[PDB]
C-alpha cells in the first residue's frame, strides 16, 4: 500500500521525523508530519518531491531532507505503509 502525502509546510517549520530501505523511525511532537497524521512510524520512505530514495544511504537521505525542508514550498512524501 503506497500513499503520497503532500504537506504545505506553512504551519510548521520542520517535518519532525527521524529516518532509519529507508524507514520513518519516529515522528516527533511539533512537526508537520505529526500534525498531518497520515504518515506513521514504520512507513518506508520511497520519494520526497522529485528525489527517489531507492539505494540511498542514510547520510544522503538526511542531506536531501535537510535541503528540501530548508527551501520554501510544499513537500510530498511517498511512503509504503507499514
Ligand atoms: C519537530 C522537529 O522537526 C524537531 N527538529 N527538527 C529538526 C531538527 C534538525 C534539523 C531539521 S531540518 O530542518 O534540517 N529537517 C530535517 C532534516 C533531516 C531529517 C528530518 C528533518 C525534519 O524536518 O524533520 C529539523 C524537534 O523535535 C525539535 C525539538 C526542539 C526544538 C526544535 C525542534
From Swiss-Prot:
Record's disease association: Robinow syndrome, autosomal dominant 2: A rare skeletal dysplasia syndrome characterized by dysmorphic features resembling a fetal face, mesomelic limb shortening, hypoplastic external genitalia in males, costovertebral segmentation defects, and renal anomalies.
Domain of life the protein comes from: Eukaryota
Mod. after translation: Ubiquitinated; undergoes both 'Lys-48'-linked ubiquitination, leading to its subsequent degradation by the ubiquitin-proteasome pathway, and 'Lys-63'-linked ubiquitination. The interaction with INVS is required for ubiquitination. Deubiquitinated by CYLD, which acts on 'Lys-63'-linked ubiquitin chains.
Written domain comment of the UniProt record: The DIX domain promotes homooligomerization. The DEP domain mediates interaction with the cell membrane.
Protein name listed in UniProt: Segment polarity protein dishevelled homolog DVL-1
SUBUNIT field: Interacts with CXXC4. Interacts (via PDZ domain) with NXN. Interacts with BRD7 and INVS. Interacts (via PDZ domain) with VANGL1 and VANGL2 (via C-terminus). Interacts with ARRB1; the interaction is enhanced by phosphorylation of DVL1. Interacts with CYLD. Interacts (via PDZ domain) with RYK. Self-associates (via DIX domain) and forms higher homooligomers. Interacts (via PDZ domain) with DACT1 and FZD7, where DACT1 and FZD7 compete for the same binding site.
Entry function: Participates in Wnt signaling by binding to the cytoplasmic C-terminus of frizzled family members and transducing the Wnt signal to down-stream effectors. Plays a role both in canonical and non-canonical Wnt signaling. Plays a role in the signal transduction pathways mediated by multiple Wnt genes. Required for LEF1 activation upon WNT1 and WNT3A signaling. DVL1 and PAK1 form a ternary complex with MUSK which is important for MUSK-dependent regulation of AChR clustering during the formation of the neuromuscular junction (NMJ).
Family: Belongs to the DSH family.
Subcellular location: Cell membrane; Cytoplasm, Cytosol; Cytoplasmic vesicle
UniProt domain PDZ: residue ranges: 4-67
Lineage of producing organism: Eukaryota, Metazoa, Chordata, Craniata, Vertebrata
Gene name of the encoded protein: DVL1
Amino acid at each position: 500500500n503506497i500513499v503520497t502525502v503532500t504537506l504545505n509546510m506553512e504551519r510548521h517549520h520542520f517535518l519532525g521525523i527521524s529516518i532509519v530501505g529507508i524507514y520513518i523511525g519516529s515522528i516527533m511532537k511539533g512537526g508537520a508530519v505529526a500534525a498531518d497524521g497520515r504518515i506513521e512510524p514504520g512507513d518506508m520512505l520511497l520519494q520526497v518531491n522529485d528525489v527517489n530514495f531507492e539505494n540511498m544511504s542514510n547520510d544522503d537521505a538526511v542531506r536531501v531532507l535537510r535541503e528540501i525542508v530548508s527551501q520554501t514550498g510544499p513537500i510530498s512524501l511517498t511512503v509504503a505503509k507499514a
